[PDB]
Design a protein around this ligand. Structure first.
Ligand SMILES: Nc1nc2c(ncn2[C@@H]2O[C@H](COP(=O)(O)OP(=O)(O)NP(=O)(O)O)[C@@H](O)[C@H]2O)c(=O)[nH]1
Ligand SMILES: Nc1nc2c(ncn2[C@@H]2O[C@H](COP(=O)(O)OP(=O)(O)NP(=O)(O)O)[C@@H](O)[C@H]2O)c(=O)[nH]1
Ligand SMILES: [Mg+2]
Ligand SMILES: [Mg+2]
Lengths: 168, 91, 88, 167
């Protein structure tokens, strides 16, 4: 019997939720586009000396499958809210995602980490200023990542874990 | 005055490091076994698979399993009381 | 579980589009689908509580989907063609 | 009345076929990605002085809906084959698309190749190898960009030109 952590990755289509998860778990990035419906991962790993089994849920960005959202948001322990730095729309979508997390299992303090995903890309359409400012108002962490270079991947996921155990 | 035929079904498909437990996969009323195998296999970034090496088998409740015949319509072949499959090879 | 692909045409005040193909799960209720097609169209501003999803059947026959219904189970199944209109 | 042209836009996932179709009409580029199954559009516009109504079909890139290929390829008049300049895989995918179109029962079908991401810095396929393919297919090749709108008009119109040419 070890500690089980249930992470769930939410965000707009294409923000790179699947890519980050595949990076953490399989240590690789393929450029291939592949819309996901629902991918489940289970991996054992030690974090800050604690052996635990990670239950990561790679969710769909497409509304088509958000018919499942009330169930998987119920079950989930912590939520990784992802936007792409190039996609402004994704960033605005976070509002909606959080509210949905709050409404399901009514609580205003839920373990979350906001993530800005494609930080290697030159475009940069959203400032980290206005992102970190949101995170401050949400009073949650904020990590800029890149599934391509693997920058921040470990940091992001593990932080959510830390946030989860912090909310026993 | 009677239900219309369904276009697609969502199935979950589970060799190698099983970082992933399963992946949800869409299968049309038109899909043959190879179509589905290559689909899940390409999700899994295992490009080298010839598709004719792998086999897609359904796991029913009560620890009972059944293998889907290759080059057959998976939509009509499956028991429809499961939704859960797995891929395996043959060294 | 099972899904259907349907095509839905908008109110089309402007030229817009002819139709958009849409996937509906066995789990989808009418609001889900209406907001879906509403977002597909350039009516991000529009509330889904206002619109009505109407199946078109042969013989110039229509069927309006109740606000609360599961479209997957509601639809006549002699048509995969729908239409979205105001209901104002 | 009006001359009717039935265009159909095919290509791999994400190449940006939806983006440029939607750019054609009511002119805009939305960065939001929304996978398409089958979207139908209709617009009237003059080309080389000819008023005509375009029937554009924005097809899916996802294998899941290739089950519809035999139908939409039957009905369609002309085919816009799209790859992304950054995705080498998309470029290789065109082979498959064309051969499926060839199997209308003709070795000549009205079609035009397009490379949609001309604005991206990280080109993985050069124009040389692209126009060389187009020469072997004996069809045009336009580098477009749904973002900047560069070549969108050019690309669509060219397919129209190819259509009227074909009879
Ligand atoms: N350069 C770069 N590309 C990325 C990054 N993350 C994802 N991508 C790319 O962006 C695309 C979308 O990634 P993906 O993980 O499928 O997105 P998603 O958020 O899972 N979309 P969906 O909701 O359909 O599952 C893919 O081509 C992927 O390779 C990143 O950090 N950097
Ligand atoms: N920079 C840039 N982005 C583009 C271009 N074309 C498309 N995109 C982007 O790439 C993504 C995919 O666009 P979309 O047109 O939906 O791709 P698709 O070929 O229709 N995909 P699908 O097969 O699912 O229908 C979107 O985020 C879009 O903004 C382009 O020329 N330049
Ligand atoms: Mg994905
Ligand atoms: Mg699309």
């Amino acid at each position: 019997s070890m500690t089980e952590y249930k992470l769930v990755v939410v965000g707009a289509v294409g923000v790179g939720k699947s890519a980050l998860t595949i990076q953490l778990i399989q240590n690789h990035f393929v450029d291939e586009y592949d819309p996901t419906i629902e991918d489940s991962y289970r991996k054992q790993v030690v974090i800050d000396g604690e052996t635990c089994l990670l239950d990561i849920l790679d969710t769909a960005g497409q509304e088509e499958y958000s018919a499942m959202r009330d169930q998987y948001m119920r079950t989930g322990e912590g939520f990784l809210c992802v936007f792409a730095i190039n996609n402004t729309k994704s960033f605005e979508d976070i509002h909606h995602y959080r509210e949905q997390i709050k409404r399901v299992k009514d609580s205003e303090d839920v373990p979350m980490v906001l993530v800005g995903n494609k930080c290697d890309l030159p475009s940069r359409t959203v400032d980290t200023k206005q992102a970190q400012d949101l995170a401050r108002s949400y009073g949650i962490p904020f990590i800029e990542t890149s599934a391509k270079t693997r920058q921040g991947v470990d940091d992001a996921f593990y932080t959510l874990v830390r946030e989860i155990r912090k909310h026993k | 005055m009677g239900p219309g035929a369904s276009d697609c079904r969502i199935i979950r498909v589970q060799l190698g490091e099983d970082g992933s437990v399963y992946k949800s996969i869409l299968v049309t009323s038109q899909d043959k076994a190879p179509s589905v195998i290559s689909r899940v296999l390409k999700k899994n970034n295992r490009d080298s698979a010839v598709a004719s090496e792998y086999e897609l088998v359904q796991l029913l409740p009560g620890e009972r399993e059944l293998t889907i015949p290759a080059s057959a319509n998976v939509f009509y072949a499956m028991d429809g009381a499961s939704h859960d499959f797995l891929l395996r090879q043959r060294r």
